Design a binder for this molecule. Structure first.
Ligand SMILES: [Fe+3]
Ligand SMILES: [Fe+3]
Ligand SMILES: [Fe+3]
Ligand SMILES: [Fe+3]
Ligand SMILES: [Fe+3]
Ligand code: NA
Ligand code: NA
Ligand code: NA
Ligand code: NA
Lengths: 170, 170, 170, 169
């Protein structure tokens, strides 16, 4: 074994490599959304920055898992990062609905990864996932659900513009 | 020859004089738009200030070319500054559409002036135009295209008022 | 055409989409190198941080080209980001030699993209590439060449450790 | 029962007393290594301070478990602190290899104690161990593994001296 390795199962190691790819994929989706809201014919700059930020955050999520792989003595194996499903993402509301489903997909994958750690009695991996990943996911799903509700409330047009200036602005 | 003159073709010198007049003309158009949005029956003061600033910037564009003419040893020859095409400029959206076409006209003239410097191997004139003029034009066309898209999004009425207060305000 | 489009050829637009993918690929290679030097059996943390920062820089190179695509009125079309050629990168010296070849591949691709802008008389795109990309590549190729020379000078073992603590550390 | 006691099994209480002794033992081993690198014929003063600090940290680990025992209503029962297996610890590389084994033994003992808490549904004790012990052990095993790799890279002699001045300081 690698010299750090203790109580670290090959199934957990492989699950981490899968999750790494999924976090990189989500980063790529949010990068595409960022540049979609940066188009001259969309032009919602705070929506763009919001997805810019979330793209960067997902990349950090991926790198923290890579670091955790190394820390426990696993070996990172990278795969292609698939291009996003779409090239353009519709209305602000539609884009938020898309990211809710993405965040729920990542959340279920993290919960499935947590189950692997649990099967193999990997108490430290479970605590790492709960604190660094599962808490963030429930917060993200809360934030996106709020975005969807408000965008439905304000409607299309002036409402989308004002949401960019008020809520999406930092 | 004038004492600075080196690698500076009479066609480039004449092209600069033509471009100086065009920049002064663009300044005059934005001055008209400034005072149009300052009318009691239009009364959108941040739109007004935006065209005021753009009028001022175009005048400095013209003056920087005058300075460059002198720097290379050419001789400035001024012409009448034609009055703008209209006396009034319609809606905020219509005024922004007018401005996009103006900036595209100025941009093509600068590219045509760049082509003259290029024909005559005026490497320094090309670098001056790219850095001090072509980059600004690409940025201005971007900025105005965004204005048009947002004004179409927010619509007339409250939308124009909020666009004045949010985006157009400094 | 899109609103901003002027003097912007479809061949240049397509070339930018290709270059965006190449920059994202180089980011992925440096991310792999980052985590490789973060392995417990390599454990050169300033080499790791060096490749982490180069990965971040290459990702910003990609995003700047995405922004330029939008600014000129092109449409970003993303493709899969291919996984790096190797999972492990050898000695510090070997990884740097790999890095030199990658930056030369990127540099030739950028020169090839510059030539497309040149064919189509895209004066602004040429100036953008020169200032924001070509200068960086000459600097990076210089920096990696120096690293290779110094790593050959210090040799393996203590030399690699001291290079990590002196030159690679900030 | 003691007045705070609730959801606290006698097997967990006994396991805490065993783990307290092991943390005190680990502190004693690192104290011996500290003073070994302080010998006039070893004289690597930053290695010495590294093991000095880890000896203090292990003693803090023991006292945190003592406080936890009291907090939950258990009773601390102390045992002899056995002397370390050796009186002298060899090269920096050998001392680090010994330390990796020691930290792995402590980690397994903490995982076994976490298992006892889990058996008896002691949710609070598991969370305490996870946050205050298990995360620290994976960090420590990471740090020592890096030390071993670098000591193998730099070799004996000048390399050990430079490692003392750079990484260990
Ligand atoms: Fe994530
Ligand atoms: Fe101008
Ligand atoms: Fe690059
Ligand atoms: Fe301990
Ligand atoms: Fe927990
Ligand atoms: Na944009
Ligand atoms: Na007025
Ligand atoms: Na590491
Ligand atoms: Na001493």
């Amino acid at each position: 074994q690698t010299q750090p390795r203790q109580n670290f199962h090959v199934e957990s190691e492989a699950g981490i490599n899968k999750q790494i790819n999924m976090e990189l994929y989500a980063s790529y989706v949010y990068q595409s959304m960022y540049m979609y809201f940066d188009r001259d014919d969309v032009a919602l700059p705070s929506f763009a920055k919001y997805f810019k930020h979330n793209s960067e955050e997902e990349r950090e999520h991926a790198e923290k898992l890579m670091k955790y792989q190394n820390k426990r003595g696993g070996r990172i194996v990278l795969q292609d990062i698939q291009k996003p499903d779409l090239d353009e993402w519709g209305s602000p509301l539609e884009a938020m609905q898309t990211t809710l489903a993405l965040e729920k997909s990542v959340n279920q994958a993290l919960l499935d990864l947590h189950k692997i750690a649990d099967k193999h009695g990997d108490a430290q991996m479970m605590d790492f996932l709960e604190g660094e990943y599962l808490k963030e996911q429930v917060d993200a799903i809360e934030e996106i659900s709020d975005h969807i509700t408000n965008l439905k409330r304000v409607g299309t047009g002036l409402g989308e513009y004002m949401y960019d200036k008020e809520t999406m602005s930092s």
